[PDB]
């Protein structure tokens, strides 16, 4: 008949764009984030085809977190007079974990030098009784700049004008596929940028039950993501009572060493409840049996091997970096009181899987304690198989971020349409 | 589970004829031709697409759960052992 033009029709297309930060003295620079009740609109009669393994939000979040990490280490002290020949002895005469290492150092005047000491961990020094820092042959050290805090705070990811973020409200939702309950939103909820390898902490819980999501479960080279419907409380502690001592290494440059420890030297550790973990493992086995035979045997085991970052549950509690031995949890074999996990502490950190640059971490005085809620798991399956066995695994932060952005997606609005109508222009 | 078989066993194709090696499997399948006392080489990947650097005569086709590779204008140098691997499961192959 005739063609007519409509401006402002509801139509969207898949696209990728830069999303900015809205968030209600911090590493993630939330002061630059714009201030953020947000409205959410329900869409009926609609089924959007979602995919969580190929969305661009995770890549942009990864590069933005890396950029925020990098730009917050520029102003603060560059510790590269500390690559000298240390002389270390035992702290007491658990044994051999701490060392008293003395060395020479520079001072405010170029022609003068001083002799100082500090308490180092066994994981930060390498023997040449003369030791040296672990990474003076591979990278340079910059201090962690005590004026900032490492505590994560929620961050939103909001879209520009002309774009929208679709959400899936299906409770029992698989990683990929249609969502019969799509809604729209300007931007997401608060996401805490927490770093961990084997257990997910301070995350978002499932609504209905435990969910299993992997890109292709038949391929053993891809990890399995497990989400709990109820959290598992875990208490981590650092019994030692440290004292921090400040050392001047130049004009306006300060190095924060460790004076000593008051009282007794005790091992840092984390506690989990046995019965709740047993129930959680039973639920996980019941859900895992759906992707295999109904009579197959399930097993769990210690990590196979690798670096210290992937073989141990790694995180930070209040500014100290914990690596915890988790081989007491995955100890089971399923056929159809508390648990204490010894931990170790490290200060020289190679973060984001980069081998070029490293970071220090000043000692924090007082006793440190954390209470956190385990929400998820990352697993791998041994190939060559009944009797499927699963090991803990991790090391890639995109798996950490993907467990939060599995329901969101970004779309672009196209407000032009042409339609047949009987009207004729004058 | 993954079940995959390669029935033809040994063949007796002659020079200048067309040969076909068939197999059945589920999942991604790849064809390798190994000469005696040498490392394997990839001919066709995903069971339909041929890697760059192999002559265009080698062609493999998939239908349902049955795959097979056909070679036409056979040359004397093509007397090797041909086998198909899904993910981590391999069969002895055909010679």
């Amino acid at each position, epitope marked *: 008949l005739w063609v007519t033009v409509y401006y402002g029709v509801p139509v969207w297309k898949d696209a990728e764009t830069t999303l900015f930060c809205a968030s209600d003295h911090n590493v993630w620079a939330t002061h630059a984030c714009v201030p953020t009740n947000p409205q959410e609109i329900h869409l009926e009669n609609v089924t959007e085809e979602f995919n969580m393994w190929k969305n661009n939000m995770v890549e942009q979040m990864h590069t933005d977190i890396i950029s925020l990490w990098d730009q917050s280490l520029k102003p603060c002290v560059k510790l590269t007079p500390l690559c000298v020949t240390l002389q270390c002895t035992n702290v007491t005469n658990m044994r051999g974990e701490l060392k008293n290492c003395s060395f020479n150092m520079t001072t405010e005047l170029r022609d003068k030098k001083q002799k100082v000491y500090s308490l180092f961990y066994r994981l930060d020094v390498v023997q040449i009784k003369e030791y040296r820092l672990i990474n003076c042959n591979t990278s340079a050290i910059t201090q962690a700049c005590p004026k900032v805090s490492f505590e994560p705070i929620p961050i939103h990811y909001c879209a520009p004008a002309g774009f929208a973020i679709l959400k899936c409200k299906d409770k029992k939702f698989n990683g990929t596929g249609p969502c019969p309950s799509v809604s729209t939103v300007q931007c997401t909820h608060g996401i805490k940028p927490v770093v961990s390898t084997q257990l997910l902490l301070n995350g978002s819980l499932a609504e209905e039950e435990v969910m299993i999501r992997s890109e292709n479960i038949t391929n053993n080279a891809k990890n399995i993501l497990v989400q709990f419907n109820t959290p598992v409380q875990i208490n981590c502690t650092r019994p030692n009572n440290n004292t921090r001592k400040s050392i001047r290494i130049g004009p306006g440059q300060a190095f924060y060493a460790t004076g000593d420890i008051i009282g007794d030297i005790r091992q840092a550790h984390c506690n989990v409840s046995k019965a709740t973990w047993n129930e959680t493992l039973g639920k996980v086995v019941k859900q895992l049996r759906k992707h295999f035979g109904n009579n197959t045997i399930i097993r769990f085991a210690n990590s196979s091997g690798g670096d210290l970052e992937v073989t141990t549950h790694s995180f930070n509690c209040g500014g100290e970096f914990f690596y915890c031995n988790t081989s007491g949890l995955f100890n089971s074999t399923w056929i159809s009181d508390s648990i204490t996990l010894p931990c170790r502490i490290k200060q020289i950190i190679n973060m984001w*899987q980069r081998i070029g640059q490293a970071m220090y971490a000043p000692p924090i005085q007082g006793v440190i304690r954390c209470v956190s809620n385990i929400t998820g798991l990352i697993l791998t399956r041994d190939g*060559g198989s009944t009797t499927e066995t699963f090991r803990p695994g991790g090391g890639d932060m995109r798996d950490n971020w993907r467990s939060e952005l599995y329901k969101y997606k970004v779309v672009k609005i196209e407000p032009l349409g042409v339609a047949p109508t009987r009207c004729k222009r004058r | 589970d993954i079940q995959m078989t390669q029935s033809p066993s040994s063949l007796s194709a002659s020079v200048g004829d067309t040969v076909t090696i068939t197999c059945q499997a589920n999942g991604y399948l790849n064809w390798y031709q190994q000469r005696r006392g040498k490392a394997p080489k990839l001919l066709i990947y995903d069971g339909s697409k041929l890697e760059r650097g192999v002559p265009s005569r080698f062609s493999g086709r998939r239908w349902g759960q049955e795959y097979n590779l056909t070679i036409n204008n056979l040359q004397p140098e093509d007397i090797a052992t041909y086998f198909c691997q899904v993910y981590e499961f391999v069969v002895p192959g055909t010679r």
Partner: nanobody
Amino acid sequence: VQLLQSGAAVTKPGASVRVSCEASGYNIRDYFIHWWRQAPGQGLQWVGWINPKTGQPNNPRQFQGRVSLTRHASWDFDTFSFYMDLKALRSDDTAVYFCARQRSDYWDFDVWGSGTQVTV
């Protein structure tokens, strides 16, 4: 893209053998490395992969507790060395060992190693 291999090794029963590959020609950290072994007059047998970025291996139930996979990068991350250790040589461990590069999710190994003869 070129890999390398070590010479043939002869070891007594109840000993340990070490086989090394070396990949110099490409971005090593972005592709897995797989190991295979072939018995005389038999098809290929799967040995597990190793992730170059983190080093975590994955071995089947047959080789659990007997095989170790490690990698050691060098300065500037230009070359890599991938090792394979076998703990207790048995009567029927004789085979030829290859190292392969998985290009993508299809599990298609375009580049293979020269091979090593292991005899007890």
